Design a protein around this ligand. Structure first.
Ligand SMILES: [Mg+2]
Ligand SMILES: [Mg+2]
Length: 223
């Protein structure tokens, strides 16, 4: 669609708690904008880095991929994890598609198809928990739409018997929100990272602000 442009510049914060003025003035001690190949190189050259992806100017442009931060503070047997991931995709796509259909004028079947057909999953290396980020690579909305969906997702987490669905962290749907970049640390005191998982090997597949639509992409927003 002519009214939808993409984004290939990834804005990252370099620590937790970056002051708003430093985001706005782009103080390089705190923030930097990268193309994906430059971001990969920065990570390789700064192995202590703690990077957090965020929208550079959400008032001007706020198209994002649907993403979830799943924070289960428990171990799962491998078979239970695999079954739960499959069920999670069904439950979450059904819930987003219903919301998109009723609140966004969306084509329900296109939300279902786009979300189920292409998503990336990280895995936290902390084996005492079941923590991951999921990005629906081909399902796009605006951040304000995700904020409007926050309570619907909260209610889904409270009604589900799936331990992963119950662990969706809905606090991430907010202005100036961040998602820690795959492969990087949270703080200088914790060495655990999220790793990529097959079949997605490219960093752009793990970024919620990277927008490169094609005919498989589906976009919806509040209407
Ligand atoms: Mg998390
Ligand atoms: Mg969280």
């Amino acid at each position: 669609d002519a009214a939808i442009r993409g984004n290939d510049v990834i804005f990252v914060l370099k620590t937790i708690g970056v002051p708003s003025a430093c985001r706005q003035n782009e103080d390089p001690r705190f923030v930097e904008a990268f193309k994906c190949d430059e971001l990969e190189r920065y990570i390789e050259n700064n192995p202590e880095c703690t990077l957090f992806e965020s929208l550079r100017d959400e008032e001007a442009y706020s198209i994002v991929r649907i993403f979830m931060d799943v924070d289960l503070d428990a171990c799962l047997d491998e078979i239970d994890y695999l079954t739960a991931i499959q069920d999670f995709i069904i439950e979450v796509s059904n819930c987003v598609a219903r919301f998109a259909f009723t609140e966004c004028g969306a084509i329900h079947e296109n939300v279902i198809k786009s979300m189920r057909s292409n998503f990336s999953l990280t895995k936290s290396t902390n084996r005492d928990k079941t923590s991951f980020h999921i990005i629906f690579l081909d399902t796009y909305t605006t951040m304000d739409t995700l904020i409007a969906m926050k309570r619907t997702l909260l209610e889904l987490s409270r009604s589900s018997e799936n331990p992963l669905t119950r662990s969706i962290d809905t606090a991430v749907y907010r202005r100036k929100t961040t998602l820690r970049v795959v492969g990087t640390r949270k703080n200088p005191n914790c060495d655990t990272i999220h790793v990529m998982q097959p079949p997605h090997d490219n960093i752009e597949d793990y970024l919620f602000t990277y927008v490169d639509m094609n005919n498989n992409s589906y976009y919806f927003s509040l209407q």
